[PDB]
Chain A
Amino acid sequence: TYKYVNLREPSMDMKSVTDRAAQTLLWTELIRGLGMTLSYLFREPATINYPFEKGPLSPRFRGEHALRRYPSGEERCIACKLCEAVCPAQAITIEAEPRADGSRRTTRYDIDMTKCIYCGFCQEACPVDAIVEGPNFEFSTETHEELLYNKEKLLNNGDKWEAEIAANIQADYLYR
């Protein structure tokens, strides 16, 4: 089915022809348009008072990256390199070797935050919930180099944001 958006024949009776004459000379349809912007003047605006008020987000939000630990404090990351393989932007760089004990752990874990597209494939790919995108979106920097995160920066992010991150995973993991 279709409909016509603009296929009208206007009435030619005297009343309709005078109603259009008054509209042309008295600008009635232009005054009607003033009424609508007047009605907005007296509405409450939609502005929020940033940074005192914040735009609503959900637990799924994809923000700054972090590397997480188990409750014991051991790193979750096992240097499987699945996040590095799936990264659409090739933003992750990883090196690994046996730790001083026998553990399989990374020696390099970099994210070029200026290559990253914040797509979240890395946290989907991770089998142990080690790499996540956190809820933080207020980390703009004065230099480019400050956005090339090494493993120390990402572990600090996890230690900094774990309290919020764990609660967000708790809200969403049954959808995953």
Chain B
Amino acid sequence: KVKQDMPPVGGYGPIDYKRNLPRRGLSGYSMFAVGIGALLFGYW
């Protein structure tokens, strides 16, 4: 019987390609509030 390089019986598993940049981090309100809170503690 012929034996040459072929893909598996049901094909290969799924391959990702779409862009994926996960969304991370806090909101603008939260980050500004932390910074202003740090300033006020420092001033005091």
Contacts and interface: CB of A to CB of B under 8 A. Distances in A.
Q: Do chains A and B directly touch (beta carbons under 8 Å) in the complex?
A: yes
B31 A32 contact: no
Nearest to B5: A175
Nearest to B31: A22
B24 A21 contact: no
Interface string B3-37: 00000000000000000000011011101100100
Interface residues of A, number: 10
A26 interface: yes
Interface in A120-135: none
Contact of A26 (B24, B29, B31): B31
Interface residues of B, number: 8
B40 to A, nearest CB: 17
A36 to B, nearest CB: 11
A22 B24 contact: no
B27 A18 contact: yes
B25 to A, nearest CB: 6
B24 A19 contact: no
Contact of A21 (B25, B28, B35): B28
A43 interface: no
A28 interface: yes
Interface of B: 24-25, 27-29, 31-32, 35
22 contacts: A15-B27, A15-B28, A15-B29, A18-B27, A18-B28, A18-B29, A18-B32, A19-B27, A19-B28, A20-B28, A21-B28, A22-B27, A22-B28, A22-B31, A22-B32, A23-B28, A26-B31, A26-B35, A28-B25, A28-B31, A32-B24, A32-B25
The 8 tightest CB contacts between A and B, nearest first, are A18-B28, A22-B28, A19-B28, A22-B31, A21-B28, A26-B31, A22-B32, A19-B27
